[PDB]
Amino acid sequence: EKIIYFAAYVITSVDEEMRHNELSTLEAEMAVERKAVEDQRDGELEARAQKLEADLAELEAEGAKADARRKVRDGGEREMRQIRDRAQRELDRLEDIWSTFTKLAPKQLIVDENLYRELVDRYGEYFTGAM
Amino acid sequence: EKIIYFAAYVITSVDEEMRHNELSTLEAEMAVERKAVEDQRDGELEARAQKLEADLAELEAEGAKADARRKVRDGGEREMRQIRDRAQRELDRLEDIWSTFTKLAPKQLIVDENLYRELVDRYGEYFTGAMGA
């Protein structure tokens, strides 16, 4: 085999009717979780933007040269890109968990343990599978 | 015509590209709003059930008669039905607004003023409508 992993878990049973019944409640719970990620992110971004505005205003009061101002400006932008990028990672991971849960069907092979373990804690009741 | 209404609005154009692009975001946003209704509902149901239990206990300590304890039981169940029913009407309305927006297409005739007004406030950028027939 050309697929290399620690362990695989096959999917045998999915309670489609039960999942179907609670899907709306489950989709809302994921959107609440997603929005708390986006809200934390927006809060961090605004705080960083304020810090950068005050840092530049400080350099100006001190009559610093353009190069010093540019470095602060560039540094702030990089930090804010990191905040966006880190948050995107967390959002993409939740999208993957939700996507795998929603399209969960028997004869599927789950070959990343962290993903498998995420499916169990969040949706253990709706499925059964074996190593 | 045998269809009766105050005033109707033809959809003239739908910005499908943007709807398609913002759909995922819009959908989570509706689901959050939907859940806020459901959470309020559940809180009220749970608190009201506690009340009914305590109220029955109180009739017990005062040694009230059965027909008295029953009317308070039935009045409790009634109110709890009303909590469930009222919130369901609100959920039904949110479901309709969202359903209408997703399947919204040129030439569609929107004939309830309150629905139109909700569509415009929630998703005004996405579509164009004219009152004239």
Does residue B132 lie within any of the structural domains?
A: no
Residue B128 C-alpha, separation from nearest chain A C-alpha, in angstroms? 29
Residue A125 lies in domain:
9-130
Q: Residue B85 carries which side chain, given as an amino acid letter?
A: D
Does residue B56 lie within any of the structural domains?
A: yes
Instruction: Write down how long chain A is.
Output: 131
User: Torsion angle, CA of A43/A44/A48/A50, rounded to 10 degrees?
Assistant: 20
Q: A16 near A127, Cβ under 8 Å?
A: no
Does residue B13 lie within any of the structural domains?
A: no
Candidate from A24, A25, A31 with C-beta closest to B32: A31
Cβ-Cβ pairs closer than 8 A, A with B, add up to 23
Determine if residue A9 is left, alpha or beta; phi over 0 gives left, psi from -120 to 50 gives alpha, anything else beta.
Answer: beta
Q: B103 near B122, Cβ under 8 Å?
A: no
Q: Residue B21 carries which side chain, given as an amino acid letter?
A: N
Does residue B63 lie within any of the structural domains?
A: yes
A contacts of B33 (beta carbons < 8 Å): none
Sheet containing A9-14, strands listed edge to edge, beginning at the edge strand earlier in sequence: A109-110, A9-14, A127-130
Does residue B51 lie within any of the structural domains?
A: yes
How were these coordinates obtained? X-ray
In angstroms, the CA A127 to CA A14 distance is 5
In angstroms, the CA A101 to CA A123 distance is 8
For testing contact with chain A, the best of B25, B35, B92 (most A CBs within 10 A): B35
According to DSSP, residue A9 is labeled: E
Candidate from B27, B28, B38 with C-beta closest to A35: B28
Axis crossing angle, helix A113-123 with helix A66-102, rounded to the nearest 10: 70
Q: For the CA atoms of chain B, what is the radius of gyration?
A: 22
Helix (H, G, I), strand (E, B) or coil at A37: helix
Q: How many domains does chain A have?
A: 1
Residue A37 C-alpha, separation from nearest chain B C-alpha, in angstroms? 13
Does residue A93 lie within any of the structural domains?
A: yes
